[PDB]
Design a protein around this nucleic acid. Structure first.
Ligand SMILES: [Cl-]
Ligand SMILES: [Cl-]
Ligand SMILES: [Cl-]
Ligand SMILES: [Mg+2]
Ligand SMILES: [Mg+2]
Ligand SMILES: [Rb+]
Ligand SMILES: [Rb+]
Ligand SMILES: [Rb+]
Length: 136
RNA sequence: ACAU
DNA sequence: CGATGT
């Protein structure tokens, strides 16, 4: 219904899917970039969407912040809720890095607590999420 | 179909 | 147009 402006927004950017994956988190109110992950040579859109949310959880917990996180990814929100990223991406030598990060993100979720609400950004009503990369 |  | 997902 209403944007919660006091929040963190996250998004993935990619060159190909599967392809080069990066992600970032921004203050929804101001657009200030709060974190950015160095590009990962091969991953999927949904792995990056998932990593971005988990990184946001870790970022907010470290700072004792109760702000919610917005993501536009139905898939990644569900994977975080389940603590399991059900990616189809083949596990091989070239995908080792993204899968290591996904595995470590799941491991963190399984060993830590948080109350952070993870909210769906309503792109159809509100336009692109504020963490968007201008690239489609 | 919906979300990317 | 293609791929990733529920
Ligand atoms: Cl990560
Ligand atoms: Cl909330
Ligand atoms: Cl959702
Ligand atoms: Mg997105
Ligand atoms: Mg985007
Ligand atoms: Rb803390
Ligand atoms: Rb984009
Ligand atoms: Rb599809």
């Amino acid at each position: 219904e209403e944007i919660i402006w006091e929040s963190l927004s996250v998004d993935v950017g990619s060159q190909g899917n599967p392809g080069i994956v990066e992600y970032k988190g921004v203050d929804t109110k101001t657009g200030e970039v709060l974190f950015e992950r160095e590009p990962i040579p091969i991953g999927t859109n949904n792995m990056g969407e998932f990593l971005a949310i988990v990184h946001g959880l870790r970022y907010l917990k470290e700072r004792n912040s109760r702000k919610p996180i917005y993501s536009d990814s139905q898939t990644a929100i569900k994977w975080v809720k389940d603590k399991k990223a059900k990616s189809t991406l083949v596990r091989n030598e070239e995908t080792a890095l993204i899968w290591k990060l996904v595995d470590e993100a799941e491991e963190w979720l399984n060993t830590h607590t948080y109350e952070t609400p993870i909210l769906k950004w309503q792109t159809d009503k509100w336009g692109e999420i504020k963490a968007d990369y201008g690239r489609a």
